[PDB]
Amino acid sequence: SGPVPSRARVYTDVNTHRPREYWDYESHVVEWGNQDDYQLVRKLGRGKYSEVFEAINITNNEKVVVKILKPVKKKKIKREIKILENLRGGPNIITLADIVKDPVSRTPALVFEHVNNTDFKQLYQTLTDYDIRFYMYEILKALDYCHSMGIMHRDVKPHNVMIDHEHRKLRLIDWGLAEFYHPGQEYNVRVASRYFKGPELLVDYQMYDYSLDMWSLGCMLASMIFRKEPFFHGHDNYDQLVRIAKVLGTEDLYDYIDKYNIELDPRFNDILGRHSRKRWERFVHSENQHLVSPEALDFLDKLLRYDHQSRLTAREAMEHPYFYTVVKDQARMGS
Amino acid sequence: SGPVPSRARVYTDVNTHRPREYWDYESHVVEWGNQDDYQLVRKLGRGKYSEVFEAINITNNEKVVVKILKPVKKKKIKREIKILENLRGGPNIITLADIVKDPVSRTPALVFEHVNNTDFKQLYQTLTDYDIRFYMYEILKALDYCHSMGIMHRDVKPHNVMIDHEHRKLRLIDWGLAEFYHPGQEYNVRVASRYFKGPELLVDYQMYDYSLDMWSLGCMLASMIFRKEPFFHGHDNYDQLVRIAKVLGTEDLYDYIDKYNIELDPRFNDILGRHSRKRWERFVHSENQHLVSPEALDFLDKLLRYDHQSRLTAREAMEHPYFYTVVKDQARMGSS
Amino acid sequence: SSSEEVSWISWFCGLRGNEFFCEVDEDYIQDKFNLTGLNEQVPHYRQALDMILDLEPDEELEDNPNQSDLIEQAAEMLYGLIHARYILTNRGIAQMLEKYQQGDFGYCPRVYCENQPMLPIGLSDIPGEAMVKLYCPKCMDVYTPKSSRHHHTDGAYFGTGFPHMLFMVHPEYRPKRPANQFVPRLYGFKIHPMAYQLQLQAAS
Amino acid sequence: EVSWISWFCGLRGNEFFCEVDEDYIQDKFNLTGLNEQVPHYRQALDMILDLEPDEELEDNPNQSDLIEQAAEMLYGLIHARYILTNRGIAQMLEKYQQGDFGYCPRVYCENQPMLPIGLSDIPGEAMVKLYCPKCMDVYTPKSSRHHHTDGAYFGTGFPHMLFMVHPEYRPKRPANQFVPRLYGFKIHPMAYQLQLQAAS
Ligand SMILES: Nc1ncnc2c1ncn2[C@@H]1O[C@H](COP(=O)(O)OP(=O)(O)NP(=O)(O)O)[C@@H](O)[C@H]1O
Numbered sequence A: 001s002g003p004v005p006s007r008a009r010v011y012t013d014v015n016t017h018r019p020r021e022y023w024d025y026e027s028h029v030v031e032w033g034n035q036d037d038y039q040l041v042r043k044l045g046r047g048k049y050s051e052v053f054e055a056i057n058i059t060n061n062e063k064v065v066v067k068i069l070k071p072v073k074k075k076k077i078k079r080e081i082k083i084l085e086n087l088r089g090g091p092n093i094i095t096l097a098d099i100v101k102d103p104v105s106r107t108p109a110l111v112f113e114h115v116n117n118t119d120f121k122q123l124y125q126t127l128t129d130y131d132i133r134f135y136m137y138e139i140l141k142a143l144d145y146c147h148s149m150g151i152m153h154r155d156v157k158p159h160n161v162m163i164d165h166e167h168r169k170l171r172l173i174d175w176g177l178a179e180f181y182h183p184g185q186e187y188n189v190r191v192a193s194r195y196f197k198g199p200e201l202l203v204d205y206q207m208y209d210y211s212l213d214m215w216s217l218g219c220m221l222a223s224m225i226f227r228k229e230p231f232f233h234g235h236d237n238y239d240q241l242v243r244i245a246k247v248l249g250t251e252d253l254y255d256y257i258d259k260y261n262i263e264l265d266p267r268f269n270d271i272l273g274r275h276s277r278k279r280w281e282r283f284v285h286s287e288n289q290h291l292v293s294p295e296a297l298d299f300l301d302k303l304l305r306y307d308h309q310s311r312l313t314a315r316e317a318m319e320h321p322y323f324y325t326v327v328k329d330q331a332r333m334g335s
Numbered sequence B: 001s002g003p004v005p006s007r008a009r010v011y012t013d014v015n016t017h018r019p020r021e022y023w024d025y026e027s028h029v030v031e032w033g034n035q036d037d038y039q040l041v042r043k044l045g046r047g048k049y050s051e052v053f054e055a056i057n058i059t060n061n062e063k064v065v066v067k068i069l070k071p072v073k074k075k076k077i078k079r080e081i082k083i084l085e086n087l088r089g090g091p092n093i094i095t096l097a098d099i100v101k102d103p104v105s106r107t108p109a110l111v112f113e114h115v116n117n118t119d120f121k122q123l124y125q126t127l128t129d130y131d132i133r134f135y136m137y138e139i140l141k142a143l144d145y146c147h148s149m150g151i152m153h154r155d156v157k158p159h160n161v162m163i164d165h166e167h168r169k170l171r172l173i174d175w176g177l178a179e180f181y182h183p184g185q186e187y188n189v190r191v192a193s194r195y196f197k198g199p200e201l202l203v204d205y206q207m208y209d210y211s212l213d214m215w216s217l218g219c220m221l222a223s224m225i226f227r228k229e230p231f232f233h234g235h236d237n238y239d240q241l242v243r244i245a246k247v248l249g250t251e252d253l254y255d256y257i258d259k260y261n262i263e264l265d266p267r268f269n270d271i272l273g274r275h276s277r278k279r280w281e282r283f284v285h286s287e288n289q290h291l292v293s294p295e296a297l298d299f300l301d302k303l304l305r306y307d308h309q310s311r312l313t314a315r316e317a318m319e320h321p322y323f324y325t326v327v328k329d330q331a332r333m334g335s336s
Numbered sequence C: 001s002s003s004e005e006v007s008w009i010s011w012f013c014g015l016r017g018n019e020f021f022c023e024v025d026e027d028y029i030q031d032k033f034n035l036t037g038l039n040e041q042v043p044h045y046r047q048a049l050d051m052i053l054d055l056e057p058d059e060e061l062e063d064n065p066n067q068s069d070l071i072e073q074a075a076e077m078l079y080g081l082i083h084a085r086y087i088l089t090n091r092g093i094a095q096m097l098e099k100y101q102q103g104d105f106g107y108c109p110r111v112y113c114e115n116q117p118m119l120p121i122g123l124s125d126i127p128g129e130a131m132v133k134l135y136c137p138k139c140m141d142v143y144t145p146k147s148s149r150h151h152h153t154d155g156a157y158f159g160t161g162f163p164h165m166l167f168m169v170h171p172e173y174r175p176k177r178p179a180n181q182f183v184p185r186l187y188g189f190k191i192h193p194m195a196y197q198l199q200l201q202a203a204s
Numbered sequence D: 001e002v003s004w005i006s007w008f009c010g011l012r013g014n015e016f017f018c019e020v021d022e023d024y025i026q027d028k029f030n031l032t033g034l035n036e037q038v039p040h041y042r043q044a045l046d047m048i049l050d051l052e053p054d055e056e057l058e059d060n061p062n063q064s065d066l067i068e069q070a071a072e073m074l075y076g077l078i079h080a081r082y083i084l085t086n087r088g089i090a091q092m093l094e095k096y097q098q099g100d101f102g103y104c105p106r107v108y109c110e111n112q113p114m115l116p117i118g119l120s121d122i123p124g125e126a127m128v129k130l131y132c133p134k135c136m137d138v139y140t141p142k143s144s145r146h147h148h149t150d151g152a153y154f155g156t157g158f159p160h161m162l163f164m165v166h167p168e169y170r171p172k173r174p175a176n177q178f179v180p181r182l183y184g185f186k187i188h189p190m191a192y193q194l195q196l197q198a199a200s
């Protein structure tokens, strides 16, 4: 017929057995707070669908943060509230403070907890083996949990992970992109930042799963231990799947699309080529070899693989040998 | 034939025996304060040669008053400072706060203590026997003192007496008219408000003394107890000495000028006439008899007399029977 | 190459009162991801927005609603709400601010602001409910435009928060408070609390 | 064919100026101290009262026009002294009820009519300004016309004085104030905002 179906190995039917409400945010209603409850202060960062400042809940003077959702559809706005709410109270799953709106502009405004996120220029500039392993683990914790609740992020990236290095606390953000995983469901492949997109997205394969978060993750680790922000640095959208291929190889790629008979926009045809699958030992400059470990590599290689079904999952990544040292010190995993 | 020279029966030589400095203000130097020291508030009235506001000494936030002497001669300005200084610290003699000037305009500005005046026109109608006696006494205190320092006011009138009825505090003002009494010295008789001028002034007798302040006072009291503001109400300057005559009588008057052979501007000749000396019992309407006492009358009659030498003086007025009751309590000073 | 009739923008950003307006390069207008939600405001959204990007007419058609001109309005009308949204943009600011460094906007009326250059603003984001004003980064208060020309520009087209926003982005650019203040002086010195002064509206 | 005063008080920028009836000018008791300021005091003041020239005389110092200056220059110091007067006030205040003076730029003063004033009583050290009885602060004149009138000619204290005399005429404080809002709400102390002049 054309492209071949696929599905999710774990948490494969969470949403299924859950209520219509849990997943149908389209028909979700918001319980707004009060604008006056908190006022602005200093600007933190810009987005494309929103602007983020640092405010303060005047009702107590507690440093709060405020994202202001720029006009979009009632959709992308709701599928960020509902999601956010089902996850809040989750581990490392950024707590959703509250929702308000410009009394006049009727403009939307999100509120979360505060986080002294150390910028990365510092982070990937003074982290050591453990740190990474450690943090990489805390992240999975989140992914596993949101996956548990049957939700995928679709926008994982350094940009979206608040790190309180002083407080070894870490939280994930921007749930605007995350959606729900439903069996055999096609989603939009125009998600995630360029440098962090998955192959399924680079080849218009619209029926992916949580596995997507994993790729984007693998990317992060690469750039990290190897120290190349980002590791897959392409110009356009097509030069991304190109850089990617100049590393995992070309073969496993074609074999992928084959395994799924997918309409590969003929454009690539002359852009990819023929490439060997470089042995990671190629990205070990003198300046990073102290982050580079065999389990490290190994672990990585088990995410960075064209087929989305072949990437390790939450729980799985979490049980790899890279993490051992880390989880050991988890005297009571679950308690 | 050349007008009869008299002399200030009392304090006749105070200034004499006093230093050249004390009386020669022309050669007096001012120790100015700081403009910035205080800033304005309300405007307490206009004027023609000075404007008064209510300010405040920023250096403590104390309600002060500010007269702004409009351009005149260095004279009239100095003969109000020097005077004012020698008197200050005087009984009921308005304390001279300070002197400043517009840093650029070089404009002068006087400063005095503050006083909650319940303007006479609205207060007097509500005074009782004592009040008057009381106040009339505090005034004398002033006059006596300034006379002590050998100075005459030449402008005593309700208009010039600040009364803080609530605080029973009282101060005299407008020392622009006051001058020094020197033996045999001729002064200008174009002083004092019409209604409060003395006969020596209404008959161009230019050699008068402190006794002048007394007449003007007598007038006040009359108007007061009798309740006729003013009691000697004339039109021009000649119709004043006319009304006055329609009361003390004509006789004592002529006898006066005679006693001093004075050039009586023949104008009066047909304006005065022949008048008996009304017995004060003529000004006692039902509405004032409660301020009208015999000592009151008596006391008065002893000021309102053409001859300036016959008027009671400061200390003297002060020892009259009208004042007894008051004089007593005052002594009950510190003694209580 | 030789002809620079520029768009419709270089045109409209060159009329009286449209001195405050900055030319909104289309990179941002073409990206329909921004024009979002507008269509449910301006009338004849399309027909208008084309006129704005300089496309092509709809020329022989009728004109009962005199649309041939009714659109002209929507064109300008609409370009406003865009210019507003724009100037917010991290880039639109650099343009605005370009005009600030040379105050195409005007300076502060107060004398103690010492000719402080201001930036437009709107008291309301609603058309007709107000016109443009002039926030001053120094005094931190607003003033009605100087000349009578800039008197028919809707505040809504400049955004109530544009100025405030601009400094969230460029706090460096927020001037210092007035060196000195106005000191009232009469004949030589200050005027303590005239609190009383006011008290006279009962007998006035 | 018509008075000098009504002529000069009819030129550009001289809209704030009020015609100083000579009742006060003739009364030389007022012109006091001026002579030791303006040059050619006499010759000038004549020109102002509309007397008679001094016409065949020389003109090396171009006196025939240098006096024009003194005339206007002088009429200034008088107009200032005048508007002070309890009457000169009525004239000024006449122009206020119809603000020939102009209104307040602030938007929360709601087109509040203002009165001229001078930052300094010295010629050239400043020009006229505009006290606003509401905001109680000053603003530089609107139109570029009223831009060469010396503040000195209106008196630093004139405005304040005017209300000492007419307290009833002192406006009410702004009904409401300007409330800064972005996307929906107020902006708490930007104290920090400023802090960046160290790295700017
Ligand atoms: N120390 C003071 N405390 C309170 N009010 C004062 C004081 N000194 C002066 N005044 C006011 O100022 C007036 C005096 O002003 P002044 O310079 O004498 O003027 P004048 O016009 O010649 N007098 P007048 O008849 O009272 O209007 C008094 O009649 C008071 O109302």
Ligand SMILES: [Zn+2]
Residues within 6 Å of the ligand: C108, C109, C110, C113, C116, C136, C138, C139, C140, C141
């Ligand atoms: Zn300002």
Ligand SMILES: [Zn+2]
Residues within 6 Å of the ligand: D104, D105, D106, D109, D112, D132, D133, D134, D135, D136
């Ligand atoms: Zn104002």
